[PDB]
Amino acid sequence: VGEVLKQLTEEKFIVKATNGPRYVVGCRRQLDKSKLKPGTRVALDMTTLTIMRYLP
Amino acid sequence: VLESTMVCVDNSEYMRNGDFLPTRLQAQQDAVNIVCHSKTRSNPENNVGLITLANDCEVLTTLTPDTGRILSKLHTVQPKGKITFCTGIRVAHLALKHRQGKNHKMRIIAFVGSPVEDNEKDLVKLAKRLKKEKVNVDIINFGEEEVNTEKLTAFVNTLNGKDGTGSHLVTVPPGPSLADALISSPILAGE
Amino acid sequence: APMSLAIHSTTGTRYDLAVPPDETVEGLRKRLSQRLKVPKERLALLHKDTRLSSGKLQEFGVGDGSKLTLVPTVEAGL
Amino acid sequence: AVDTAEQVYISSLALLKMLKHGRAGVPMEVMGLMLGEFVDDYTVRVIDVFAMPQSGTGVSVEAVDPVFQAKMLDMLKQTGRPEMVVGWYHSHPGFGCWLSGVDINTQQSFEALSERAVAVVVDPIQSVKGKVVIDAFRLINANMMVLGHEPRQTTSNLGHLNKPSIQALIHGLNRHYYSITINYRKNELEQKMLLNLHKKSWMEGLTLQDYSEHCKHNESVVKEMLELAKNYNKAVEEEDKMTPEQLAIKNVGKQDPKRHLEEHVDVLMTSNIVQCLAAMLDTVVFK
Amino acid sequence: LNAKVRLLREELQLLQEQGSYVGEVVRAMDKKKVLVKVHPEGKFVVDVDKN
Amino acid sequence: AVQKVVVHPLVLLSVVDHFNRIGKVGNQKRVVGVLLGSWQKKVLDVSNSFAVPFDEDDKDDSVWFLDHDYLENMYGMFKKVNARERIVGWYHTGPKLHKNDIAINELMKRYCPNSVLVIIDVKPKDLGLPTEAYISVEEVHDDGTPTSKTFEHVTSEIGAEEAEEVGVEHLLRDIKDTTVGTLSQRITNQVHGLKGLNSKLLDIRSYLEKVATGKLPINHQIIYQLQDVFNLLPDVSLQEFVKAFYLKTNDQMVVVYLASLIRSVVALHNLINNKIANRDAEKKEGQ
Amino acid sequence: QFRNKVLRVLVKIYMNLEKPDFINVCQCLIFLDDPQAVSDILEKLVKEDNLLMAYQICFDLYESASQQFLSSVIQNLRTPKDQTLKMIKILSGEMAIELHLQFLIRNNNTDLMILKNTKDAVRNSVCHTATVIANSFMHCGTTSDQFLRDNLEWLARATNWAKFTATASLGVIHKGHEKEALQLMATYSAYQEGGGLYALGLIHANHGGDIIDYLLNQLKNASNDIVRHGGSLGLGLAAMGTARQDVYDLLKTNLYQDDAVTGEAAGLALGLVMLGSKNAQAIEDMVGYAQETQHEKILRGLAVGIALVMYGRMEEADALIESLCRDKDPILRRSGMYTVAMAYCGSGNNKAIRRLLHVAVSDVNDDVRRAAVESLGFILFRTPEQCPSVVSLLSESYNPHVRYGAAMALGICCAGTGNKEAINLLEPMTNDPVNYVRQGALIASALIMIQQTEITCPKVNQFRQLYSKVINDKHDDVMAKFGAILAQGILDAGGHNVTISLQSRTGHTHMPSVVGV
Amino acid sequence: EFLHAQEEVKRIQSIPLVIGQFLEAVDQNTAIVGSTTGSNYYVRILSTIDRELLKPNASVALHKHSNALV
Secondary structure, eight states, X not given: OEEEEEEOSSSOEEEEETXXXXXXXXXXXXXXXXXXXXXXXXXXXXXXXXXXXXXX | OOEEEEEEEEOOGGGGOOSSSSOXXXXXXXXXXXXXXXXXXSOTTOEEEEEXXXXXXXXXXXXXXXXXXXXXXXXXXXXXXXXOTTHHHHHHHHHHHTOSOSSXXXXXXXXXXXXXXXXXXXXXXXXXXXXXXXXXXXXXXXXXXXXXXXXXXXXXXXXXTTTOXXXXXXXXXXXXXXXXXXXXXXXXXXX | OOOEEOEEESSSOXXXXXXXXXXXXXXXXXXXXXXXXXXXXXXXXXXXXOOOOSSOSTTTTOOTTOOEEEEEOOOOBO | OOBTTOEEEEOHHHXXXXXXXXXXXXXXXXXXXXXXXXXXXXXXXXXXXXXXOOOOBTTBOOOOOHHXXXXXXXXXHHSSOOOEEEEEEEEOTTTOSOOOHHHHHHHHHHHHHSTTOEEEEEOTTTOOSSSOOEEEEEEOOHHHHHHTOOSOBOOSSTTOTTXXXXXXXXXXBTTTEEEEEEEOOOOSHHHHHHHHHHOOOHHHHHOOOOHXXXXXXXXXXXXXXXXXXXXXXXXXXXXXXXXXTTTGXXXXXXXXXXXXXXXXXXXXXXXXXXXXXXXXXXXXXXX | OXXXXXXXXXXXXXXXXXXXXXXXXXXXXXXXXXXXXETTEEEEEEOOOOO | OOOEEEEXXXXXXXXXXXXXXXXXXXXXXXXXXXXXXXXXXXXXXXXXXXXXXXXXXXXXXXXXXXXXXXXXXXXXXXXXXXXXXXXXXXXXXXSSOOTHHXXXXXXXXXXXXXXXXXXXXXXXXXXXXXXXXXXEEEEOOSSSSOOEEEEEEOEEEEOOOSHHHHHHHHHHXXXXXXXXXXXXXXXXXXXXXXXXXHHHHHHHHHHHHHHHHXXXXXXXXXXXXXXXXXXXXXOSTTSSHHHXXXXXXXXXXXXXXXXXXXXXXXXXXXXXXXXXXXXXXXXXXXX | OHHHHHHHHHHHHHHSSSSOOHHHHHHHHHHTOOHHHHHHHHHHXXXXXXXXXXXXXXXXXXXXXXXXXXXXXXHHHHOOXXXXXXXXXXXXXXXXXXXXXXXXXXXXXXXXXXXXXXXXXXXXXXXXXXXXXXXXXXXXXXXXXXXXXXXXXXXXXXXXXXXXXXXXXXXXXXXXXXXXXXXXXXXXXXXHHHHHHHHHHHHTSSOOSTHHHHHHHHHHTOOSHHHHHHHHHHHXXXXXXXXXXXXXXXHHHHHHSOOHHHHHHHHHHHHHHHTTTOOHHHHHHHHHHHHHOOOHXXXXXXXXXXXXXXXXXXXXXHHHHHHHHTSSOHHHHXXXXXXXXXXXXXXXXXXXXXXXXXHHHHOSOHHHXXXXXXXXXXXXXXXXXXXXXXXXXXXXXXSHHXXXXXXXXXXXXXXXXXXXXXXXXXXXXXXXSSHHHHHHHHXXXXXXXXXXXXXXXXXXXXXXXXXXXXXXXXXXXXXXXXXXXXXXXXXXXXXXXXXXXXXXXXXXXXXXXXXXX | OHHHHHHHGGGTSOSSEEEEEXXXXXXXXXXXXXXXXXXXXXXXXXXXXXXXXXXXXXXXXXXXXXXXBO
């Protein structure tokens, strides 16, 4: 679980994972990039850390 | 036998006729039903397809071993226009060509009760083409027992050559539904 | 009458076998898994859009040479 | 015994479909099958690749519809490609080109079916706007490893294979699976097509850029040039004087005058010169 | 130019290697060992190379 | 009214490959298939396709076997594979359009209310894109014959998002020619545009010659358009146009002149630096 | 044309001498073709009874001129009888190779201890074949075989495409031993059978006895891809240059029997047979089969075949060369570059070098870039001092295949010459961060230092020790050891009694040498 | 070739990477970077970074493992 920080270009986002490190990752297509926005939480994947599902 | 059967059906404005009880269109429906059932009782994998002959000689169903879709689609038909033939036969031959099962023998059957406005020379040339393309044709004529029976006899003789028995003609005079003739017809009697 | 069968393989090896008139789907899957030295669990059978999984094959109507294709169960990941 | 010089010529169509599928499937280790052919003992021709509707879990994938696949096979035989299965491919978005345990098992199955099957791996995450991160693979026989036999006789220098990747080594490269060389062959139609893809239309080819926008563009460029000249003069005011050699590039990590000057002067060359040429050429060619 | 581009190719090729930590020297002793702090983590001793 | 259509490299290569199939299979000279894309806005994105067994006789032109049952089967099949793909058009590999096309387009429109036909020229050219986009519109012939079902041209071009770009440009780099050299590339664009214009006017001249000889009937509409073109031709020796032309060319040359000064001064600076550095170095080797 | 005119004038001047130097006369005649002139001169010398002069002329002719020229002269002479027979035999070269055979036999200085070291260092089948080849090189045409008759188990350790190379090495070792041919091979599966055919061909390399007919019969009666490939290679070697329609026909049939294994050998053998003879018929046939057949292996075979077929015709190559160089396939572009090499061998044609460098630098396929630079190497051999500059600027390249090609070009340039600058430039290359590049550096250095000593070239020790170290190293690559092993085989090839020069001692290009290299 | 190769480096510039702050650039091809992981590493920078945006204490990607600035 980590909250996105910036809509970097289109398929790139800076997300600060709750554990502390900050990453840049791309998101699965079926996520309506408009939905997620600075401050929204998301569930990145173990291995690749692509944004899988945004959360309230 | 493995059989891929194309079937053309006339729907000319004459098929508005009702000389055959109950009416010509319903006689065609009966004929298609009986033929489809006969083919199904034949090798089940045998495949079937349908064409309607009109001003534009349209195609209804491509090859398929089913008969439910066949009959269902054929129901939603009304007689209109005049048979264009020639083009219909060519389309049916292309259909048989583009058949998934190549092993299946290629057989066309045409319900052609109508007057045929065709040149017999081109009929003969088409006969040559089709025989060289190795497809056997069976005609079911009703109505014009005189207008086109000679033409169709010549066409069938052409297809047969000296031994091409696979070609068949069945012309039925005025009378009841086109069921008894088909069932007691050589084309299905051989079956 | 050990009816034969047409076990097609999407890879191509069209090996086949004959079994008694009544045979089990899982028994046949065992036969093929043995013949291929591969586990049964990762084999899937087909019969005209039908994924044969359990039965005597007459529950599905399999006759002589009924054209059963063996699509391998492909699963990637880690 | 298999050969080292074995090649896989993948159709451009196949490559495009593989890459598009995987890029769609990130992060899912999406999977697809391909139809090719085994022309001989040294070559495998890959024609087309079609995906699998299955959408499993974010760490794994699974075959769903063997009926789906059999029907695809029959129909493509009817029209399309009368090839028939030769391997399978799946994306590994950000891992390299190695085969997981399940990957290896799927393969083992594939070879069991057809001893010379192939696996394929693609990294749409890594495949760059240029070179493309892909590879082919075939397992290594544990019987051979224990008996001391070797994977392939290398009757060639086509065994360099471009420095097998350290990551692949780690994940098991050359100890259970060995890389194979990919290639691209075009029967000239797709080739000149590819050529056509980028080519643009004479619409623009002759369409002179609007001139008001161009004048303003020149205005802005000359202004930024003036400022760059000012800072360049300041920079040269010392340059070598006061000896920044020790400073070297680390004199300042920002705002090099010369590089910006040359970049913008070049771009305004391009713009102004070509627009003037188009003006001349049109004025004279439409009469 | 050829040297530039070779440098670039190699740079891509072997940037996979990990970098290095920055440590604050605290004390020194025999050439064999020297003390140093590795921020943020604790203070240790290191076996210096031949520089 | 679908003003704008973008085809995609994947569909392009797929059509090419299928045409190659058919060429090997026999001699059909043309082939047909279906075109899947998401009709985003009034701008179609033809982003995938698949062939359909088609045929016709060279003589009658009313005979063909487009298989609507196959069509529906695999349209649903690809819908299953992926969702955002509902038919939008159809492609044919015909060097020129055919009469058959209107009837076939009506058939396809039976599935797509606004279907788009596209001609893909497997045979190469050097003037424009290898694709053309047409739509079956009906227009009233203001005079004489009634309205007819005739095809109409729509702005067709080509694009790719990122992944298709990577794949295509990779294969290109593998077998291609020099990339954008800026000046070189855009001058090549100028000359290519001139070549295209010349070829088009060659075509129109040939048609005019055929009409003048009487090989075909006069089309007052095509005439209308031609004399509209000529009426639209400009005047260069207008003595106002020329003054403006000289004035703005003077401005263009002024900016280019200053930019040339920039280039010269920087090069001279480089020469001074290199000379002094080399002198100091050789002095060092002297001592 | 002007060169030929001046040659004719000089020949006439020579003839206009108290004791005309028929040596120079026949040399210039060879440069002028004209077998009739030399035949008539020789017959006149026969009448003069100048037996020694005729012997010397015949030996020079055999050394320099081409098989077609010698055959024309042979038939013209056939048009006392003992002296005529001696002339005929000498011109055919029979016993003119037995001399060299006995020469090596009586001088076969070979330090097999170094190869014992190597075979101790050998682990992989790669280096196994490497050492097989190196031993074949060492022995060269010697009837004495040590490893093959001693390390029988070690030989057995190699199989697959190793038995073939082993039998080929056997052929190389017993090179030229025509006397027991068809009985020597009584000593030595499909691989070994094909290798036997190939080795028989090598034994009859450029010497087309009835073995050409025998190989034709066998290759026709070949029932395996491997057997067909080996027999194709052997027959092509036997009939190299001597374009014979029956042989070309059998090769065409085997080639049309589409198969990578057989196809590669078919292409090579076609090029060999029709070498320098440039039949447009066969040219079009090969080009078409190449452009239509989908087997990159056969495609390489046809590449070499089309390059070879048209060795002569120095300038009469522009059409085909331009076609190939503008062709589609990279392999066919490579074919074109090799064809340019074969056409312009030793000409130093600046147009040819323009083409070759431009393509080697601008093409998009590294394989063809490498091939093009190697072609440059072939072309510039008559002017060894020239090549170093270009091959240097190249060798220090971006593309490791470009660097490798530069190395091999230097090797061709200085083959048998032992240049100093060439080695000065090779040493930095070897020990490079790539495998094949180092392999090529090693092979080129060995080629240059062939039959050289320390005093003549004060780096042979450095490079011999480098070979020994690399062979007895761990972290070098398998192919690096392969290159080192071949480098040793080169340096100490043939009892350390043989060298490699493209042009005969008469300053005359040697077609067999060029094709072999 | 150089313009071709300038692009391959983006391969190292993959998606799943880390962020940090530029602290100091040493000679030509290396810098100190305080990664968000909490530690600061000396590592050899990538080329084609323009060496101009690396202003003191500026955000910079770092490759996930190598940690070299990308």
